[PDB]
Design an enzyme around this catalytic site. Structure first.
Site, mmCIF file in Angstrom:
data_model
loop_
_atom_site.group_PDB
_atom_site.id
_atom_site.type_symbol
_atom_site.label_atom_id
_atom_site.label_comp_id
_atom_site.label_asym_id
_atom_site.label_seq_id
_atom_site.Cartn_x
_atom_site.Cartn_y
_atom_site.Cartn_z
ATOM 1 N N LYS A 195 46.638 19.282 20.034
ATOM 2 C CA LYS A 195 46.509 19.189 18.604
ATOM 3 C C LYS A 195 47.631 18.406 18.003
ATOM 4 C CE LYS A 195 46.886 22.799 15.873
ATOM 5 N NZ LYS A 195 46.030 23.610 14.970
ATOM 6 N N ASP B 130 43.259 30.195 15.484
ATOM 7 C CA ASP B 130 43.597 29.986 14.069
ATOM 8 C C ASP B 130 43.968 31.190 13.204
ATOM 9 O OD1 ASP B 130 43.146 27.344 14.823
ATOM 10 O OD2 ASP B 130 41.169 27.202 13.828
ATOM 11 N N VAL C 273 37.960 15.848 19.757
ATOM 12 C CA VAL C 273 36.950 16.895 19.598
ATOM 13 C C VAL C 273 37.048 17.539 18.225
ATOM 14 C CG1 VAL C 273 36.302 17.447 21.979
ATOM 15 C CG2 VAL C 273 38.419 18.375 21.024
ATOM 16 N N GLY D 93 44.728 19.323 11.142
ATOM 17 C CA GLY D 93 45.063 18.743 12.427
ATOM 18 C C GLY D 93 43.852 18.196 13.163
#
Ligand code: 279
Length: 333
Positions: free
Chosen positions: A46, A161, A27, A29
């Protein structure tokens, strides 16, 4: 008590993950959506890219893992697991981090769609709550935008993030021109652009370049006043501002036609040029726009977070080994 890994040459890159993780579907790193067997729960997996093949990546790898292990908040992405196929610190060169898989990000929710005031209130309220937490640990996002904000079918949100940034449409003007020393309110400006786009259905400052970005921002907030300019040390930043044609700040009431009155008040408080005078996360939480959700006793902060490593200049393998320690020492929530 190791596990049994399998190999998946899919992507253009090899994935080597544990048994429980099935149906990997793609979908800094590559991420895959997957189905956890042990929990019947869908997750995000991930694979970090070349985590230890450069000093910058090595430190960033260590940085991302420390932050994920420390951050425990309903509105901040949490770590379900971290693993490597490697059986020793000598074999270690790959790192996988697993998270909960949500249904969608904010980039799609507003995908040419206007939300309701209650919807907006709830979304923005959770960002601010998660932000207060992160800011409390002394971490700042720096690139907050619709895409790193994950929401599930019930509108429950998690921030993605954060703290890595140590795609121009949401950056504070001071962090874009590098002037006046920045603070935590740099995230508050991003929230402003997001809340506005959530209420209007359109990108607040849809720039087409750096210069053109500042244009749009200044078109709405108006050029920096004498009070601001006097605090700007950068000569290059001063030359640019003083070179622009004067512009008044607009009235947000005649810009956000129809939005809840208090929305416009909060907005005005968030989209200020003076970072010194922009509202904070904890302060925005107490705003009346959020009286239905605000709860001073259910707005937790973070336990102290040791970031001294940030002032470290170690070798790749020293970073690698410290990470290895964080990996093996991990214990699931
Ligand atoms: C709404 C649908 N999307 C999703 O559910 C979704 C989409 N992604 N894309 C990238 N990374 C994701 N999670 C993630 C975040 C960090 C992290 O935040 N570390 O930085 C401090 C670390 C590892 C992972 C696996 C992610 C999720 C959960």
């Amino acid at each position: 008590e190791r596990p049994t890994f399998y190999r998946q040459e899919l992507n253009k890159t090899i994935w080597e993950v544990p048994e429980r993780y099935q149906n990997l579907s793609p979908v800094y790193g590559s991420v895959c959506a997957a189905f956890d067997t042990k929990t019947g729960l869908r997750v995000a997996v991930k694979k970090l890219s070349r985590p230890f093949q450069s000093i910058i990546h090595a430190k960033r790898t260590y940085r991302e893992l420390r932050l994920l292990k420390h951050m425990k908040h309903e509105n901040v992405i949490g770590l379900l697991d971290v693993f490597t196929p490697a059986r020793s610190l000598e074999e270690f060169n790959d790192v996988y981090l697993v998270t909960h898989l949500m249904g969608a990000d904010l980039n799609n929710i507003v995908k040419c769609q206007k939300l309701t005031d209650d919807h907006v209130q709830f979304l923005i309220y959770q960002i601010l709550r998660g932000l207060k937490y992160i800011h409390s640990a002394d971490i700042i996002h720096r690139d907050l935008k619709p895409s790193n904000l994950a929401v599930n079918e019930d509108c429950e949100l998690k921030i993605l993030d954060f703290g890595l940034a140590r795609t121009r449409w949401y950056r504070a003007p001071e962090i874009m021109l590098n002037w006046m020393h920045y603070n935590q309110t740099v995230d508050i400006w991003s929230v402003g652009c997001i809340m506005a786009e959530l209420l209007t259905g359109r990108t607040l400052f849809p720039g087409t370049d750096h210069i053109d970005q500042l244009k749009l921002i200044l078109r709405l907030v108006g050029t920096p006043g004498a009070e601001l300019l006097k605090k700007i040390s950068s000569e290059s930043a001063r030359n640019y501002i003083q070179s622009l044609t004067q512009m008044p700040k607009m009235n947000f009431a005649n810009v956000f036609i129809g939005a809840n009155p208090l929305a416009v008040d909060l907005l005005e408080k968030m989209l200020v040029l003076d970072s010194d005078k922009r509202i904070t996360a904890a302060q925005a939480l107490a705003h009346a726009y959020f009286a239905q959700y605000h709860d001073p006793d259910d707005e937790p902060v973070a336990d102290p977070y040791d970031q001294s490593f940030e002032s470290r200049d170690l070798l790749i393998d020293e970073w690698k080994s410290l990470t290895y320690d964080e990996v093996i020492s991990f214990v699931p929530p």
